[PDB]
Design a protein around this ligand. Structure first.
Ligand SMILES: [Cl-]
Ligand SMILES: [Cl-]
Ligand code: NA
Length: 129
């Protein structure tokens, strides 16, 4: 599923991401836009042979099991395919564990490079939340 921008904003808000660990909603929409262009089916392979899944491009090196990343962890306790659902719940629950792990949203390279320090409130302007 390819979310619209306000549609995603509303789903994230319902799932408790607004101001989660101090990150306003616009941060999460911004990160999703640049990580996956709001497509829950996005996958991308990393150089080490891990893969990133879903609308927040969660990495199989640490966070989910895809059966093909030897020696990786599964800290979200989920198959990586669950991260590709049209239902964003599994991605949101796992993102919450990632952003809690000490490094905040710097775990998302696109967020660091394209959202951090910008006016992220522009990402939810005009949306009915
Ligand atoms: Cl915001
Ligand atoms: Cl980047
Ligand atoms: Na894994």
């Amino acid at each position: 599923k390819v979310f619209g921008r306000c549609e995603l904003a509303a789903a994230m808000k319902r799932h408790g991401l607004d101001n989660y660990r101090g990150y306003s909603l616009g941060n999460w929409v911004c990160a999703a836009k640049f990580e996956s262009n709001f497509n829950t089916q996005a996958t991308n392979r990393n150089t080490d042979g891990s893969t990133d899944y879903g609308i927040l491009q969660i990495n199989s090196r640490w966070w989910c099991n895809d059966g093909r990343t030897p020696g990786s962890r599964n800290l979200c306790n989920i198959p990586c395919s669950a991260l590709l659902s049209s239902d964003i719940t599994a991605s949101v629950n796992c993102a919450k564990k990632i952003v809690s792990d000490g490094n905040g949203m710097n775990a998302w390279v696109a967020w660091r490079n394209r959202c951090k320090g910008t006016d992220v409130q522009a990402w939810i302007r005009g949306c009915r939340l």
